[PDB]
Symmetry: C2
Subunit: 48 residues, 2 copies
């Protein structure tokens, strides 16, 4: 059911917002981290 996927996406939407705050806080060695950090969450959202 799409509700399950929506719930999953909703959870990740929340993770993305908090993760974004962390990413907006770290400004040094997070260029590589940002790629994996955003890529992974994006991959999870994209995959599901």
């Amino acid at each position: 059911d799409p509700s399950v996927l929506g719930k999953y996406r909703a959870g990740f939407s929340e993770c993305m917002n908090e993760v974004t705050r962390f990413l907006s806080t770290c400004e040094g060695v997070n260029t590589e981290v940002r790629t994996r950090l955003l890529g992974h969450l994006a991959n999870c959202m994209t995959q599901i």
Copy 2:
């Protein structure tokens, strides 16, 4: 169904691992960030 919750937890388990890597990377102004970062993911896992 518990499968939905398990899927949700599984997604957060994945977020926690990646988030942990970010937290293990940032070492400066993330004491406050860590509290919210871990507290939020923990809150989501705890709540669901």
